[PDB]
Design a protein around this motif. Structure first.
Motif, PDB file in Angstrom:
ATOM      1  N   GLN A  86     -11.913  12.664  12.596  1.00  0.00           N
ATOM      2  CA  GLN A  86     -12.519  11.342  12.440  1.00  0.00           C
ATOM      3  C   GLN A  86     -11.580  10.230  12.890  1.00  0.00           C
ATOM      4  O   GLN A  86     -12.013   9.266  13.526  1.00  0.00           O
ATOM      5  CB  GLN A  86     -12.922  11.108  10.980  1.00  0.00           C
TER       6      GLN A  86
ATOM      7  N   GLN B 244      -4.111   4.684  -7.526  1.00  0.00           N
ATOM      8  CA  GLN B 244      -3.063   5.070  -6.586  1.00  0.00           C
ATOM      9  C   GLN B 244      -2.800   3.977  -5.556  1.00  0.00           C
ATOM     10  O   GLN B 244      -1.649   3.692  -5.229  1.00  0.00           O
ATOM     11  CB  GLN B 244      -3.435   6.367  -5.863  1.00  0.00           C
ATOM     12  N   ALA B 245      -3.865   3.350  -5.064  1.00  0.00           N
ATOM     13  CA  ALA B 245      -3.743   2.298  -4.057  1.00  0.00           C
ATOM     14  C   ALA B 245      -2.824   1.170  -4.501  1.00  0.00           C
ATOM     15  O   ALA B 245      -2.080   0.607  -3.695  1.00  0.00           O
ATOM     16  CB  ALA B 245      -5.115   1.743  -3.703  1.00  0.00           C
ATOM     17  N   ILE B 246      -2.870   0.854  -5.790  1.00  0.00           N
ATOM     18  CA  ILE B 246      -2.051  -0.213  -6.354  1.00  0.00           C
ATOM     19  C   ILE B 246      -1.247   0.285  -7.555  1.00  0.00           C
ATOM     20  O   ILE B 246      -1.019  -0.458  -8.515  1.00  0.00           O
ATOM     21  CB  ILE B 246      -2.945  -1.406  -6.771  1.00  0.00           C
ATOM     22  N   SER B 247      -0.762   1.523  -7.461  1.00  0.00           N
ATOM     23  CA  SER B 247      -0.011   2.158  -8.541  1.00  0.00           C
ATOM     24  C   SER B 247       1.263   1.460  -9.004  1.00  0.00           C
ATOM     25  O   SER B 247       1.746   1.729 -10.106  1.00  0.00           O
ATOM     26  CB  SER B 247       0.290   3.624  -8.205  1.00  0.00           C
ATOM     27  N   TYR B 248       1.806   0.573  -8.176  1.00  0.00           N
ATOM     28  CA  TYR B 248       3.028  -0.142  -8.536  1.00  0.00           C
ATOM     29  C   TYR B 248       2.796  -1.627  -8.825  1.00  0.00           C
ATOM     30  O   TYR B 248       3.643  -2.277  -9.436  1.00  0.00           O
ATOM     31  CB  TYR B 248       4.073  -0.010  -7.423  1.00  0.00           C
TER      32      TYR B 248
ATOM     33  N   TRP C 125      -9.375   2.992   4.423  1.00  0.00           N
ATOM     34  CA  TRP C 125     -10.400   4.008   4.587  1.00  0.00           C
ATOM     35  C   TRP C 125     -10.300   5.075   3.492  1.00  0.00           C
ATOM     36  O   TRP C 125      -9.238   5.662   3.282  1.00  0.00           O
ATOM     37  CB  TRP C 125     -10.242   4.620   5.985  1.00  0.00           C
TER      38      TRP C 125
ATOM     39  N   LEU D 251     -18.439   5.643  10.524  1.00  0.00           N
ATOM     40  CA  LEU D 251     -18.217   7.045  10.865  1.00  0.00           C
ATOM     41  C   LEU D 251     -19.205   7.550  11.917  1.00  0.00           C
ATOM     42  O   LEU D 251     -18.880   7.443  13.119  1.00  0.00           O
ATOM     43  CB  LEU D 251     -18.292   7.910   9.601  1.00  0.00           C
TER      44      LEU D 251
ATOM     45  N   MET E 100       0.846  -1.230   0.000  1.00  0.00           N
ATOM     46  CA  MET E 100       0.000   0.000   0.000  1.00  0.00           C
ATOM     47  C   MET E 100       0.871   1.266   0.000  1.00  0.00           C
ATOM     48  O   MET E 100       2.089   1.191   0.179  1.00  0.00           O
ATOM     49  CB  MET E 100      -0.949  -0.018   1.204  1.00  0.00           C
ATOM     50  N   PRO E 101       0.261   2.441  -0.244  1.00  0.00           N
ATOM     51  CA  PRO E 101       0.979   3.723  -0.276  1.00  0.00           C
ATOM     52  C   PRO E 101       1.654   4.137   1.034  1.00  0.00           C
ATOM     53  O   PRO E 101       2.555   4.972   1.031  1.00  0.00           O
ATOM     54  CB  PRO E 101      -0.120   4.713  -0.655  1.00  0.00           C
TER      55      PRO E 101
ATOM     56  N   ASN F 141       3.845   6.919  -0.752  1.00  0.00           N
ATOM     57  CA  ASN F 141       4.537   6.384  -1.919  1.00  0.00           C
ATOM     58  C   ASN F 141       3.518   6.235  -3.046  1.00  0.00           C
ATOM     59  O   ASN F 141       2.792   5.241  -3.114  1.00  0.00           O
ATOM     60  CB  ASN F 141       5.167   5.030  -1.587  1.00  0.00           C
ATOM     61  N   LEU F 142       3.450   7.245  -3.908  1.00  0.00           N
ATOM     62  CA  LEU F 142       2.505   7.247  -5.020  1.00  0.00           C
ATOM     63  C   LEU F 142       3.195   7.526  -6.350  1.00  0.00           C
ATOM     64  O   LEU F 142       3.867   8.547  -6.506  1.00  0.00           O
ATOM     65  CB  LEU F 142       1.409   8.290  -4.775  1.00  0.00           C
ATOM     66  N   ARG F 143       3.022   6.612  -7.302  1.00  0.00           N
ATOM     67  CA  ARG F 143       3.621   6.748  -8.627  1.00  0.00           C
ATOM     68  C   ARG F 143       3.034   7.945  -9.372  1.00  0.00           C
ATOM     69  O   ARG F 143       1.792   8.070  -9.410  1.00  0.00           O
ATOM     70  CB  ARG F 143       3.410   5.468  -9.446  1.00  0.00           C
TER      71      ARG F 143
ATOM     72  N   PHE G  51      -8.147  -5.081  -0.340  1.00  0.00           N
ATOM     73  CA  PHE G  51      -7.441  -5.655  -1.476  1.00  0.00           C
ATOM     74  C   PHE G  51      -7.153  -7.065  -0.987  1.00  0.00           C
ATOM     75  O   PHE G  51      -6.311  -7.277  -0.108  1.00  0.00           O
ATOM     76  CB  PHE G  51      -6.181  -4.840  -1.788  1.00  0.00           C
TER      77      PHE G  51
ATOM     78  N   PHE H 123      -8.362   6.876  -6.913  1.00  0.00           N
ATOM     79  CA  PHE H 123      -8.025   6.259  -5.632  1.00  0.00           C
ATOM     80  C   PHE H 123      -7.524   4.826  -5.827  1.00  0.00           C
ATOM     81  O   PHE H 123      -6.476   4.456  -5.302  1.00  0.00           O
ATOM     82  CB  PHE H 123      -9.243   6.257  -4.707  1.00  0.00           C
TER      83      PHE H 123
ATOM     84  N   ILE I 134      -1.513   5.759   8.468  1.00  0.00           N
ATOM     85  CA  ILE I 134      -2.799   5.906   7.792  1.00  0.00           C
ATOM     86  C   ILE I 134      -2.670   6.783   6.559  1.00  0.00           C
ATOM     87  O   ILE I 134      -2.151   7.889   6.624  1.00  0.00           O
ATOM     88  CB  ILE I 134      -3.858   6.542   8.722  1.00  0.00           C
ATOM     89  N   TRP I 135      -3.194   6.299   5.441  1.00  0.00           N
ATOM     90  CA  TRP I 135      -3.134   7.041   4.192  1.00  0.00           C
ATOM     91  C   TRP I 135      -4.296   8.023   4.041  1.00  0.00           C
ATOM     92  O   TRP I 135      -5.451   7.667   4.259  1.00  0.00           O
ATOM     93  CB  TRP I 135      -3.108   6.043   3.029  1.00  0.00           C
TER      94      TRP I 135
END
Lengths: 130, 128
Positions: A52, B51-55, B8, B128, A1-2, A128-130, B16, B48, A8-9
């Motif tokens: 939150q 980005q979550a699985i961008s690699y 979240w 929430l 994950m990022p 970590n985002l491409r 995933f 989203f 927390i992302w």
């Protein structure tokens, strides 16, 4: 994950709620040791996320906002100013402390207090985002 | 706001999957967690996920499918695919016994025989 485990992302950043409670200076150093910095709220989206995330915790959490005394403006660690109308700074905003004044969030509200006091903290670093 | 191992995002929680199975079994696995397979409602949702699985180079099933080319692509709830979100590439012309299902891989969406194996993405409302 990022984001690394336990972080927390949100947006383009990763956030960590500290394991320990210390004064502002030590909390800052702890984030620095993790290649991070203290929480910097740049928008309402950031504030909402933090509120939150903490949810119903009654613990105080340091953010990267501070100032020498009331005559100085509230600035983030990098020197950038607090963007207007994001949140109101309550608490001890009139007094002058030797270690300066630092901001923390508790029960969803932001307060100012002597930087020497202890609290948990929130660190953030780029995701970590491409 | 989300269970351990879930991501979240907005008012939802995303998972995933750890296992790679066919679409029907993947659907069942999301259901067992009181969730559903990924439903992309906007460009923001797509961004989203990308980005979550961008690699990653792994394929991930989403909740989009159809019996054959004569039918439209529909999410699990029966709602249609919103225009200008993404193009469904891959095996969109052929007919398979168990239907055709969509998955995302390297940021692009593809169609393939539903009996093939792939990881999957589940989603459900955040507390929430």
């Amino acid at each position: 994950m990022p984001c690394p485990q336990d972080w927390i992302w949100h947006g383009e950043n990763c956030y960590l709620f500290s394991s320990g409670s210390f004064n502002w200076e030590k909390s800052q150093e702890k984030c620095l040791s993790l290649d991070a910095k203290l929480l910097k709220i740049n928008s309402t989206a950031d504030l909402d996320f933090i509120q939150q995330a903490i949810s119903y915790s009654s613990f105080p959490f340091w953010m990267g906002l501070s100032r020498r005394n009331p005559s100085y403006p509230w600035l983030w660690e990098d020197g950038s100013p607090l963007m207007p109308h994001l949140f109101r700074v309550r608490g001890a905003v009139s007094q002058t402390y030797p270690s300066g004044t630092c901001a923390y969030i508790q029960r969803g509200a932001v307060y100012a207090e002597n930087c020497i006091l202890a609290a948990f903290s929130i660190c953030q670093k780029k995701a970590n985002l491409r």
